[PDB]
Amino acid sequence: MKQLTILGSTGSIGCSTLDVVRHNPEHFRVVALVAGKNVTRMVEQCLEFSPRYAVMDDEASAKLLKTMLQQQGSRTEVLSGQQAACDMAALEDVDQVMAAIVGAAGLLPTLAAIRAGKTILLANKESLVTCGRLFMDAVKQSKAQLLPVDSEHNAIFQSLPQPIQHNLGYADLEQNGVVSILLTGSGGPFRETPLRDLATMTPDQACRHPNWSMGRKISVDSATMMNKGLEYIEARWLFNASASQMEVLIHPQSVIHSMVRYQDGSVLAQLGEPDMRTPIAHTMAWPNRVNSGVKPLDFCKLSALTFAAPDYDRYPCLKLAMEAFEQGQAATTALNAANEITVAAFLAQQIRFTDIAALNLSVLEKMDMREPQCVDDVLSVDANAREVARKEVMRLAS
Amino acid sequence: MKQLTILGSTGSIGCSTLDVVRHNPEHFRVVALVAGKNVTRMVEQCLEFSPRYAVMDDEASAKLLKTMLQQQGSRTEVLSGQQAACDMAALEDVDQVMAAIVGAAGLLPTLAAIRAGKTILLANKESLVTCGRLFMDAVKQSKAQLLPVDSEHNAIFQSLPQPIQHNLGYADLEQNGVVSILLTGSGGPFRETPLRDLATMTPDQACRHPNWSMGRKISVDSATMMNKGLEYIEARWLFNASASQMEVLIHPQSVIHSMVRYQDGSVLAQLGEPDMRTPIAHTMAWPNRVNSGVKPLDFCKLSALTFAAPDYDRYPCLKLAMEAFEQGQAATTALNAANEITVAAFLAQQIRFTDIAALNLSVLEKMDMREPQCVDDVLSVDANAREVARKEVMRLAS
């Protein structure tokens, strides 16, 4: 029986996680839930899973949640604030922590889960893009077990050897028969449009906080393969791989989610339906399995599997991301920050598509910052880079 | 440092095994070699790997080998006979035993390797088709570690969880997250013709004892998918899977060598070049890896990956093999024996292609034997079935 804390229970990953709990009330039990302002949804989950505690963004929200739960017979106790989240991640009884809170707000709470040595279900992969060094170091110390939730990372993890799985982050690939990691993907035709996505979003698989403004940034990051690059930066930290132990492959149908190349010629891969309950069910039941309510992949109703090396010429960002990794976390944090701004600039037609990679590049060159020492320097580099990218994006719009 | 005995060192699998030893003289050391009448080749390997002992088919051969080795300064000692082979498989210093001796001659020596609790590199998969119960039972007792050498089995094994890998044969799939095993293949167009094979056989990768008469039986067994069925019977013993935990998929390009379906929706697969040094290098270095001198699979120079459920109507044998498994090892041994005879009958145009499945079927029905208790009853059922299939094949040719 595994007890767990969910950081960001009112997002896509959150409800997905709970549904795995729902189908397996005999293997899991929510100890605490953490969210932002979504009171209504929070109440639902508390009534259904009877968590010990529940944390919201601010007290105004905590109070409302505290009232509704009260006038509805709920033993759950309510708290609020960032520190309370961090404390929820370190509770003694907690075995796993689903780190599904994106952005800065997710850094400290996630770091505290590691500090405490909890099994960490990494679902905010974007945090390794900036605090890769910090998180991975802290992991090495507490021996906290990392289990990637993202689709490709989880595929790689599932395809690696036991010794590397049990010591994710600080093990050695050469010593364990691993020649390279094959990060797969598809972007250009950037897999699917945010338009076709909205059209096929069913009435229950929409726990994902709306924000249409985001699905657009994602598709742009997918057209420039900047998303592949962040996956690259991330993959290198998690698996502790070198530039020469990484291989990027374009795979259109997305059936194979990523693979691992071995010394004897063998290559291991994980395949499956695009449902996020598979990766999630995997990390939660590791090192065993559980049903996630996902359909078995049907090999008869599939399209041909294709592969191709990316054309680093049509997609400068991917090469730019791979290059920043070599320049350290200051470079990666900067690259990420500038991209946020330049992509927004492009959507707001202030610049052209092609200027994204250009501006991103110019920004990295104009900056000269040191390697972030803690979550606070990362944020400093972040904010510092967002400023330059802005002073730049306007000097062009003129 | 792993010391090993090779049973059948002058065949395709044998030299392949030694080449893995050749590239890794720091991880392996041949303790003894076993072969038949190929004196010349035996001498080569003894001079190159300095085995402690060498065993041949009969003394005439042992004497010749003993002379040539002698008049060429070889400390290796020579023996002959079946019992000597069995003794070579049970030597204290031996860590692994490459069981690459096909047919009846391979049963006892392989059984003795298991009895002794050696790590068994199963390369004569056809032995599980008749003594599945015997071998698997004996394995369970000595805790001998089985490591399948065949392409699909090794792919499945590599794609299974640790607990099942470390206890191959007697573990439970349900309990370890495994829903089913996906045995892949291709036969009709039966992959490649023995004609196109001869044409592309290079001057060094021809350690395979000639016998063109065999490559033909293989292609016929591939056109009737009787080979898929034996893979099925075998796969069930090794992985201890039920009829419902087996799925047969047709996969033309043979890049994916087989896969495993999991409870959470994940499916694991192993891919690679068709070279037998990969599976071999894997079983020898398990649970770690070693270089096998096989080229890394190039995903850029591949053809589209296709899958399809087999049409059990066009290929009765596959359905027949799956059905015999349910009837026990008497049925499977019989099915195999009759097939030998009927396929030979077809090549010798005494019957038609379509009569193979028919005759195979009639034979199973006309027989009523008990479950083989030991290697001797299996041989009895075998010989008993070969006789019927003959009395039948001639009543038709009339």
mmCIF file of C-alpha atoms in Angstrom, chain B residues 68-383:
data_model
loop_
_atom_site.group_PDB
_atom_site.id
_atom_site.type_symbol
_atom_site.label_atom_id
_atom_site.label_comp_id
_atom_site.label_asym_id
_atom_site.label_seq_id
_atom_site.Cartn_x
_atom_site.Cartn_y
_atom_site.Cartn_z
ATOM 1 C CA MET B 68 46.849 -33.026 -34.799
ATOM 2 C CA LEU B 69 46.662 -31.092 -31.517
ATOM 3 C CA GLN B 70 49.644 -33.018 -30.176
ATOM 4 C CA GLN B 71 51.898 -32.542 -33.205
ATOM 5 C CA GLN B 72 51.052 -28.865 -32.887
ATOM 6 C CA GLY B 73 51.726 -28.214 -29.220
ATOM 7 C CA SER B 74 48.300 -28.095 -27.606
ATOM 8 C CA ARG B 75 47.847 -28.734 -23.908
ATOM 9 C CA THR B 76 44.145 -29.433 -24.525
ATOM 10 C CA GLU B 77 43.023 -32.946 -23.571
ATOM 11 C CA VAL B 78 40.665 -34.908 -25.813
ATOM 12 C CA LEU B 79 37.632 -37.092 -24.998
ATOM 13 C CA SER B 80 34.736 -38.617 -26.993
ATOM 14 C CA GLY B 81 31.138 -39.794 -26.582
ATOM 15 C CA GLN B 82 27.821 -38.485 -25.283
ATOM 16 C CA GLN B 83 28.519 -39.002 -21.572
ATOM 17 C CA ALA B 84 31.715 -36.964 -21.951
ATOM 18 C CA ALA B 85 29.629 -34.114 -23.353
ATOM 19 C CA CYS B 86 27.282 -34.304 -20.391
ATOM 20 C CA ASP B 87 30.307 -34.266 -18.105
ATOM 21 C CA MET B 88 31.657 -31.219 -19.874
ATOM 22 C CA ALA B 89 28.380 -29.414 -19.172
ATOM 23 C CA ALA B 90 28.625 -30.095 -15.431
ATOM 24 C CA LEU B 91 32.276 -29.174 -14.700
ATOM 25 C CA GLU B 92 32.602 -27.140 -11.484
ATOM 26 C CA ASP B 93 34.529 -24.227 -13.054
ATOM 27 C CA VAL B 94 31.923 -23.796 -15.806
ATOM 28 C CA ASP B 95 29.602 -20.814 -15.320
ATOM 29 C CA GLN B 96 27.646 -20.973 -18.626
ATOM 30 C CA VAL B 97 26.801 -23.694 -21.136
ATOM 31 C CA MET B 98 25.988 -22.832 -24.728
ATOM 32 C CA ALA B 99 23.557 -25.575 -25.675
ATOM 33 C CA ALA B 100 23.832 -25.415 -29.454
ATOM 34 C CA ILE B 101 23.426 -29.107 -30.342
ATOM 35 C CA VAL B 102 20.220 -29.777 -32.267
ATOM 36 C CA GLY B 103 18.153 -32.959 -32.273
ATOM 37 C CA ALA B 104 18.163 -35.911 -29.896
ATOM 38 C CA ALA B 105 21.936 -35.722 -29.437
ATOM 39 C CA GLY B 106 21.365 -32.378 -27.684
ATOM 40 C CA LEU B 107 18.780 -33.498 -25.118
ATOM 41 C CA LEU B 108 20.860 -35.372 -22.541
ATOM 42 C CA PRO B 109 23.875 -33.063 -22.678
ATOM 43 C CA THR B 110 21.564 -30.076 -22.259
ATOM 44 C CA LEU B 111 19.629 -31.779 -19.448
ATOM 45 C CA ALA B 112 22.923 -32.386 -17.603
ATOM 46 C CA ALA B 113 23.804 -28.695 -17.818
ATOM 47 C CA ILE B 114 20.490 -27.890 -16.115
ATOM 48 C CA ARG B 115 20.838 -30.685 -13.543
ATOM 49 C CA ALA B 116 24.214 -29.140 -12.611
ATOM 50 C CA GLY B 117 22.553 -25.762 -12.176
ATOM 51 C CA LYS B 118 24.607 -24.031 -14.856
ATOM 52 C CA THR B 119 23.506 -20.848 -16.567
ATOM 53 C CA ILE B 120 21.960 -22.358 -19.725
ATOM 54 C CA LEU B 121 22.216 -20.491 -23.045
ATOM 55 C CA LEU B 122 19.312 -22.213 -24.822
ATOM 56 C CA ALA B 123 20.207 -22.293 -28.496
ATOM 57 C CA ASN B 124 18.437 -25.533 -29.371
ATOM 58 C CA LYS B 125 14.941 -24.196 -28.694
ATOM 59 C CA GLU B 126 13.537 -27.250 -30.501
ATOM 60 C CA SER B 127 14.259 -29.279 -27.331
ATOM 61 C CA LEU B 128 11.485 -27.457 -25.437
ATOM 62 C CA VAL B 129 9.080 -28.641 -28.139
ATOM 63 C CA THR B 130 9.458 -32.219 -26.903
ATOM 64 C CA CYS B 131 10.889 -32.122 -23.376
ATOM 65 C CA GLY B 132 9.320 -28.836 -22.374
ATOM 66 C CA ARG B 133 7.928 -30.373 -19.200
ATOM 67 C CA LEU B 134 11.138 -32.250 -18.364
ATOM 68 C CA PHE B 135 13.518 -29.355 -18.995
ATOM 69 C CA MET B 136 11.375 -26.751 -17.329
ATOM 70 C CA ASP B 137 10.784 -28.979 -14.290
ATOM 71 C CA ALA B 138 14.499 -29.757 -13.918
ATOM 72 C CA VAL B 139 15.216 -26.019 -14.236
ATOM 73 C CA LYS B 140 12.808 -25.223 -11.422
ATOM 74 C CA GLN B 141 14.683 -27.675 -9.221
ATOM 75 C CA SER B 142 18.321 -26.745 -9.795
ATOM 76 C CA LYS B 143 17.459 -23.076 -10.121
ATOM 77 C CA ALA B 144 19.575 -23.275 -13.262
ATOM 78 C CA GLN B 145 19.237 -19.948 -15.045
ATOM 79 C CA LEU B 146 17.770 -20.217 -18.565
ATOM 80 C CA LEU B 147 18.655 -17.596 -21.160
ATOM 81 C CA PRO B 148 17.010 -18.129 -24.569
ATOM 82 C CA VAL B 149 19.342 -17.741 -27.548
ATOM 83 C CA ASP B 150 16.736 -17.848 -30.323
ATOM 84 C CA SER B 151 15.899 -14.443 -31.827
ATOM 85 C CA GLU B 152 12.264 -14.026 -30.744
ATOM 86 C CA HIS B 153 12.647 -15.666 -27.347
ATOM 87 C CA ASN B 154 15.641 -13.536 -26.493
ATOM 88 C CA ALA B 155 13.628 -10.492 -27.539
ATOM 89 C CA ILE B 156 10.777 -11.465 -25.257
ATOM 90 C CA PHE B 157 13.189 -12.266 -22.402
ATOM 91 C CA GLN B 158 14.881 -8.873 -22.798
ATOM 92 C CA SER B 159 11.445 -7.242 -22.679
ATOM 93 C CA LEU B 160 10.224 -8.994 -19.499
ATOM 94 C CA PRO B 161 10.580 -7.746 -15.885
ATOM 95 C CA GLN B 162 13.557 -8.612 -13.650
ATOM 96 C CA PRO B 163 11.618 -11.058 -11.401
ATOM 97 C CA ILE B 164 10.608 -13.098 -14.437
ATOM 98 C CA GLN B 165 14.073 -12.849 -15.973
ATOM 99 C CA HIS B 166 15.781 -14.080 -12.807
ATOM 100 C CA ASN B 167 13.294 -16.962 -12.478
ATOM 101 C CA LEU B 168 12.638 -17.868 -16.106
ATOM 102 C CA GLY B 169 10.198 -20.742 -16.388
ATOM 103 C CA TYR B 170 8.605 -20.810 -12.957
ATOM 104 C CA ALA B 171 7.570 -17.179 -12.395
ATOM 105 C CA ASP B 172 4.106 -15.661 -12.833
ATOM 106 C CA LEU B 173 3.289 -13.096 -15.508
ATOM 107 C CA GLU B 174 0.040 -11.767 -14.003
ATOM 108 C CA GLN B 175 1.801 -11.041 -10.728
ATOM 109 C CA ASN B 176 4.526 -9.148 -12.548
ATOM 110 C CA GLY B 177 2.389 -6.846 -14.677
ATOM 111 C CA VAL B 178 2.507 -8.957 -17.830
ATOM 112 C CA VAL B 179 -0.709 -9.263 -19.830
ATOM 113 C CA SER B 180 0.707 -11.128 -22.806
ATOM 114 C CA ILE B 181 3.697 -12.096 -24.894
ATOM 115 C CA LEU B 182 3.822 -11.005 -28.554
ATOM 116 C CA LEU B 183 5.615 -13.618 -30.655
ATOM 117 C CA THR B 184 6.424 -11.898 -33.965
ATOM 118 C CA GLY B 185 7.472 -13.327 -37.324
ATOM 119 C CA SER B 186 6.846 -13.584 -41.073
ATOM 120 C CA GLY B 187 6.046 -16.504 -43.369
ATOM 121 C CA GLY B 188 4.154 -16.233 -46.639
ATOM 122 C CA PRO B 189 5.990 -14.727 -48.488
ATOM 123 C CA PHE B 190 8.010 -16.956 -46.158
ATOM 124 C CA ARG B 191 10.634 -14.297 -45.403
ATOM 125 C CA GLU B 192 13.593 -15.367 -47.560
ATOM 126 C CA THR B 193 14.189 -18.254 -49.983
ATOM 127 C CA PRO B 194 17.031 -20.775 -49.437
ATOM 128 C CA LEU B 195 18.059 -19.735 -52.948
ATOM 129 C CA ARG B 196 18.535 -16.060 -52.145
ATOM 130 C CA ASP B 197 20.274 -17.132 -48.972
ATOM 131 C CA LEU B 198 22.958 -19.173 -50.734
ATOM 132 C CA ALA B 199 23.586 -16.225 -53.049
ATOM 133 C CA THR B 200 24.366 -13.801 -50.189
ATOM 134 C CA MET B 201 26.348 -16.148 -47.934
ATOM 135 C CA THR B 202 29.795 -14.561 -47.448
ATOM 136 C CA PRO B 203 33.111 -16.562 -47.152
ATOM 137 C CA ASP B 204 33.382 -16.215 -43.347
ATOM 138 C CA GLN B 205 29.804 -16.153 -42.049
ATOM 139 C CA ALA B 206 29.379 -19.702 -43.313
ATOM 140 C CA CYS B 207 30.370 -21.694 -40.230
ATOM 141 C CA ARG B 208 26.866 -23.113 -40.576
ATOM 142 C CA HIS B 209 27.223 -26.753 -41.541
ATOM 143 C CA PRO B 210 26.069 -26.782 -45.203
ATOM 144 C CA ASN B 211 23.130 -29.185 -45.504
ATOM 145 C CA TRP B 212 21.111 -27.434 -48.210
ATOM 146 C CA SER B 213 18.502 -30.149 -47.689
ATOM 147 C CA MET B 214 17.729 -28.413 -44.385
ATOM 148 C CA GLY B 215 17.402 -24.789 -45.476
ATOM 149 C CA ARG B 216 14.595 -26.126 -47.644
ATOM 150 C CA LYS B 217 12.699 -27.796 -44.803
ATOM 151 C CA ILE B 218 13.022 -24.532 -42.889
ATOM 152 C CA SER B 219 11.476 -22.454 -45.688
ATOM 153 C CA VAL B 220 8.614 -24.933 -46.063
ATOM 154 C CA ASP B 221 8.005 -24.848 -42.315
ATOM 155 C CA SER B 222 7.971 -21.120 -42.823
ATOM 156 C CA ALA B 223 5.455 -21.178 -45.640
ATOM 157 C CA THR B 224 3.068 -23.284 -43.536
ATOM 158 C CA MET B 225 3.908 -21.287 -40.402
ATOM 159 C CA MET B 226 4.662 -24.559 -38.644
ATOM 160 C CA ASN B 227 7.809 -22.746 -37.519
ATOM 161 C CA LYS B 228 5.701 -20.040 -35.902
ATOM 162 C CA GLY B 229 3.820 -22.754 -34.067
ATOM 163 C CA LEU B 230 6.914 -24.421 -32.666
ATOM 164 C CA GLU B 231 8.046 -20.968 -31.549
ATOM 165 C CA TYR B 232 4.628 -20.779 -29.863
ATOM 166 C CA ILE B 233 4.941 -24.149 -28.082
ATOM 167 C CA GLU B 234 8.449 -23.160 -27.002
ATOM 168 C CA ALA B 235 7.481 -19.651 -25.879
ATOM 169 C CA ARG B 236 4.796 -21.068 -23.601
ATOM 170 C CA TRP B 237 7.240 -23.235 -21.670
ATOM 171 C CA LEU B 238 10.010 -20.668 -21.287
ATOM 172 C CA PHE B 239 7.769 -17.874 -20.115
ATOM 173 C CA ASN B 240 5.167 -20.072 -18.486
ATOM 174 C CA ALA B 241 2.398 -18.334 -20.399
ATOM 175 C CA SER B 242 -1.150 -19.545 -21.041
ATOM 176 C CA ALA B 243 -2.979 -19.663 -24.364
ATOM 177 C CA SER B 244 -4.539 -16.323 -23.412
ATOM 178 C CA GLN B 245 -1.163 -14.732 -22.666
ATOM 179 C CA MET B 246 0.155 -15.409 -26.166
ATOM 180 C CA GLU B 247 -0.421 -13.203 -29.204
ATOM 181 C CA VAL B 248 0.951 -13.987 -32.628
ATOM 182 C CA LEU B 249 1.747 -11.064 -34.919
ATOM 183 C CA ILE B 250 3.012 -11.067 -38.492
ATOM 184 C CA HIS B 251 5.858 -8.590 -38.922
ATOM 185 C CA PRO B 252 7.393 -8.610 -42.500
ATOM 186 C CA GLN B 253 10.513 -6.481 -42.053
ATOM 187 C CA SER B 254 11.612 -8.393 -38.951
ATOM 188 C CA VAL B 255 13.101 -5.295 -37.238
ATOM 189 C CA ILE B 256 11.142 -5.857 -34.021
ATOM 190 C CA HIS B 257 12.035 -9.398 -32.879
ATOM 191 C CA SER B 258 9.117 -9.732 -30.394
ATOM 192 C CA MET B 259 7.391 -7.767 -27.621
ATOM 193 C CA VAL B 260 5.705 -7.924 -24.188
ATOM 194 C CA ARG B 261 2.310 -6.344 -23.380
ATOM 195 C CA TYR B 262 1.889 -4.789 -19.948
ATOM 196 C CA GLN B 263 -1.012 -4.119 -17.566
ATOM 197 C CA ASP B 264 -0.699 -0.308 -17.694
ATOM 198 C CA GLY B 265 -0.769 -0.262 -21.477
ATOM 199 C CA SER B 266 2.993 -0.232 -22.058
ATOM 200 C CA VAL B 267 4.469 -2.652 -24.573
ATOM 201 C CA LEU B 268 8.185 -3.406 -24.551
ATOM 202 C CA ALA B 269 10.085 -4.628 -27.576
ATOM 203 C CA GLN B 270 13.615 -5.413 -28.686
ATOM 204 C CA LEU B 271 14.813 -4.467 -32.197
ATOM 205 C CA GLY B 272 18.030 -4.995 -34.146
ATOM 206 C CA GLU B 273 20.059 -6.367 -37.052
ATOM 207 C CA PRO B 274 19.345 -10.035 -37.932
ATOM 208 C CA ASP B 275 22.823 -11.069 -36.706
ATOM 209 C CA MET B 276 22.840 -13.921 -34.132
ATOM 210 C CA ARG B 277 25.758 -12.406 -32.221
ATOM 211 C CA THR B 278 23.405 -9.940 -30.493
ATOM 212 C CA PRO B 279 21.163 -12.536 -28.763
ATOM 213 C CA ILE B 280 24.274 -14.564 -27.982
ATOM 214 C CA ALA B 281 26.276 -11.637 -26.597
ATOM 215 C CA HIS B 282 23.223 -10.794 -24.495
ATOM 216 C CA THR B 283 22.815 -14.196 -22.834
ATOM 217 C CA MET B 284 26.554 -14.441 -22.205
ATOM 218 C CA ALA B 285 26.917 -11.046 -20.547
ATOM 219 C CA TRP B 286 23.553 -11.120 -18.759
ATOM 220 C CA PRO B 287 22.746 -9.207 -16.655
ATOM 221 C CA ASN B 288 25.151 -6.750 -18.262
ATOM 222 C CA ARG B 289 26.310 -6.202 -21.851
ATOM 223 C CA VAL B 290 29.318 -6.828 -24.048
ATOM 224 C CA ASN B 291 30.242 -5.903 -27.620
ATOM 225 C CA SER B 292 29.347 -8.580 -30.173
ATOM 226 C CA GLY B 293 30.829 -6.952 -33.252
ATOM 227 C CA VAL B 294 27.369 -6.399 -34.729
ATOM 228 C CA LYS B 295 26.611 -3.078 -36.410
ATOM 229 C CA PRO B 296 24.287 -0.601 -34.688
ATOM 230 C CA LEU B 297 20.824 -0.757 -36.257
ATOM 231 C CA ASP B 298 20.412 2.228 -38.580
ATOM 232 C CA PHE B 299 16.885 3.643 -38.291
ATOM 233 C CA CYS B 300 17.436 5.825 -41.343
ATOM 234 C CA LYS B 301 18.029 2.894 -43.705
ATOM 235 C CA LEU B 302 14.938 0.911 -42.654
ATOM 236 C CA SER B 303 11.661 0.092 -44.348
ATOM 237 C CA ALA B 304 8.233 0.804 -42.873
ATOM 238 C CA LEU B 305 7.242 -1.346 -39.903
ATOM 239 C CA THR B 306 4.064 -3.325 -40.546
ATOM 240 C CA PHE B 307 1.943 -5.664 -38.435
ATOM 241 C CA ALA B 308 -0.982 -8.018 -39.023
ATOM 242 C CA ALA B 309 -2.764 -10.817 -37.234
ATOM 243 C CA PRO B 310 -2.140 -14.130 -38.984
ATOM 244 C CA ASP B 311 -4.872 -15.725 -41.080
ATOM 245 C CA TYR B 312 -5.302 -19.048 -39.306
ATOM 246 C CA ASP B 313 -7.260 -20.221 -42.342
ATOM 247 C CA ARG B 314 -4.438 -20.050 -44.876
ATOM 248 C CA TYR B 315 -2.037 -21.555 -42.357
ATOM 249 C CA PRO B 316 -3.616 -24.528 -40.533
ATOM 250 C CA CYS B 317 -0.297 -25.698 -39.022
ATOM 251 C CA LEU B 318 0.037 -22.657 -36.737
ATOM 252 C CA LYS B 319 -3.420 -23.375 -35.351
ATOM 253 C CA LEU B 320 -2.489 -27.056 -35.210
ATOM 254 C CA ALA B 321 0.677 -26.346 -33.241
ATOM 255 C CA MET B 322 -1.192 -24.113 -30.807
ATOM 256 C CA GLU B 323 -3.757 -26.905 -30.362
ATOM 257 C CA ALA B 324 -1.226 -29.681 -29.726
ATOM 258 C CA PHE B 325 0.305 -27.682 -26.894
ATOM 259 C CA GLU B 326 -3.004 -28.105 -25.127
ATOM 260 C CA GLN B 327 -2.785 -31.865 -25.705
ATOM 261 C CA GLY B 328 0.585 -32.094 -23.950
ATOM 262 C CA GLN B 329 4.139 -33.042 -24.950
ATOM 263 C CA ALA B 330 2.984 -36.270 -26.528
ATOM 264 C CA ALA B 331 0.957 -34.230 -29.011
ATOM 265 C CA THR B 332 3.726 -31.721 -29.635
ATOM 266 C CA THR B 333 6.441 -34.363 -30.071
ATOM 267 C CA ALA B 334 4.121 -36.248 -32.438
ATOM 268 C CA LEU B 335 3.215 -33.093 -34.395
ATOM 269 C CA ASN B 336 6.923 -32.342 -34.828
ATOM 270 C CA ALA B 337 7.841 -35.891 -35.881
ATOM 271 C CA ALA B 338 5.012 -36.187 -38.413
ATOM 272 C CA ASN B 339 5.937 -32.779 -39.859
ATOM 273 C CA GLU B 340 9.516 -33.888 -40.503
ATOM 274 C CA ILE B 341 8.143 -36.777 -42.583
ATOM 275 C CA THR B 342 5.352 -34.915 -44.370
ATOM 276 C CA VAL B 343 7.556 -31.985 -45.338
ATOM 277 C CA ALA B 344 10.202 -34.355 -46.684
ATOM 278 C CA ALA B 345 7.357 -36.077 -48.516
ATOM 279 C CA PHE B 346 6.399 -32.726 -50.132
ATOM 280 C CA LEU B 347 9.950 -31.833 -51.169
ATOM 281 C CA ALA B 348 10.219 -35.321 -52.695
ATOM 282 C CA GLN B 349 6.958 -34.502 -54.500
ATOM 283 C CA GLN B 350 5.283 -37.611 -53.016
ATOM 284 C CA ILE B 351 2.502 -35.353 -51.690
ATOM 285 C CA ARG B 352 1.263 -31.827 -52.287
ATOM 286 C CA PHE B 353 1.950 -28.742 -50.197
ATOM 287 C CA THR B 354 -1.608 -28.731 -48.893
ATOM 288 C CA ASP B 355 -1.328 -32.330 -47.695
ATOM 289 C CA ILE B 356 1.299 -31.387 -45.121
ATOM 290 C CA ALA B 357 -1.209 -29.828 -42.720
ATOM 291 C CA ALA B 358 -3.764 -32.542 -43.587
ATOM 292 C CA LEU B 359 -1.390 -35.455 -43.017
ATOM 293 C CA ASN B 360 0.011 -33.785 -39.879
ATOM 294 C CA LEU B 361 -3.548 -33.571 -38.602
ATOM 295 C CA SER B 362 -4.567 -37.122 -39.485
ATOM 296 C CA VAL B 363 -1.481 -38.428 -37.685
ATOM 297 C CA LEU B 364 -2.255 -36.676 -34.410
ATOM 298 C CA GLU B 365 -5.781 -38.093 -34.450
ATOM 299 C CA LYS B 366 -4.671 -41.667 -35.126
ATOM 300 C CA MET B 367 -2.301 -41.588 -32.147
ATOM 301 C CA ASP B 368 -3.105 -42.047 -28.461
ATOM 302 C CA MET B 369 0.018 -41.862 -26.316
ATOM 303 C CA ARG B 370 0.668 -40.773 -22.735
ATOM 304 C CA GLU B 371 2.618 -37.782 -21.495
ATOM 305 C CA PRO B 372 6.357 -38.492 -21.843
ATOM 306 C CA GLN B 373 7.947 -39.028 -18.428
ATOM 307 C CA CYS B 374 11.592 -38.841 -19.506
ATOM 308 C CA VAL B 375 13.814 -38.230 -22.530
ATOM 309 C CA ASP B 376 13.249 -41.878 -23.417
ATOM 310 C CA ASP B 377 9.451 -41.740 -23.756
ATOM 311 C CA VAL B 378 9.729 -38.567 -25.835
ATOM 312 C CA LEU B 379 11.951 -40.458 -28.273
ATOM 313 C CA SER B 380 9.423 -43.293 -28.198
ATOM 314 C CA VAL B 381 6.571 -40.971 -29.091
ATOM 315 C CA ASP B 382 8.813 -39.380 -31.712
ATOM 316 C CA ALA B 383 9.711 -42.652 -33.464
#
